[PDB]
Amino acid sequence: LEAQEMLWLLQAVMTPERENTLRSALATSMMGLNALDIETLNNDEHAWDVVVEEFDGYRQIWRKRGVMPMLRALMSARNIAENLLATAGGERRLTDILHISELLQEAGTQLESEHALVRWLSQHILEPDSNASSQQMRLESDKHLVQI
């Protein structure tokens, strides 16, 4: 599900004008918002204006700085990494998000266009073929786990 959430976030960053994709991407499990927060965001127009402005800033960082600076600024401003580490079971999700971010950086450094990386991510979502780099890694190494 994290690849689909990253695809929704990239579609909301690339096209922030239509509010449907932005509302579908903000209510995912990566952001971690309740239904009351989504309702107050849909009711208050100034908070939605601030959200559209900061997503336009994220789009400017995505067009100027790259993929990993935009994702790092999104994880630092929204503070979603601390919320995923505080949530029980979110460390595997955070490592999957970081691995998807590294693969998107490696695929977007070789692609000139910005929508081409989103098309590549959607194609790799639609293609479940297993490569050596596109497999799941270990979630944590310090904590001892039962190895199946």
Binding footprint of another protein on the chain (CB under 8 A): 1, 4, 7-8, 16-21, 23-24, 27-29, 32, 34-36, 38-39, 42, 49, 52-53, 56, 72, 75-76, 79, 81-90, 94-95, 111-113, 116, 122-123, 125-126, 129, 131, 135, 137-138, 140-142
Cα(33)–Cα(31) distance, rounded to whole angstroms?
Answer: 6
Quote the least distance from Cβ 146 to another protein, whole Å: 15
User: Are 68 and 105 a contacting pair, CB within 8 Å?
Assistant: yes
Least distance to another protein, CB of residue 30, Å: 10
Give the number of residues written for the chain.
148
42 contacts 29 by C-beta, under 8 angstroms? no
CA distance 148 to 88: 21
Rounded to a whole number of angstroms, the minimum distance from the CB of residue 102 to another protein is: 10
| Category of 135 on φ-ψ map: left (φ > 0), alpha (ψ -120 to 50) or beta | beta
Cβ-based neighbour number of residue 60 at 10 Å: 11
Q: How far is the CB of 25 from another protein (least distance, A)?
A: 9
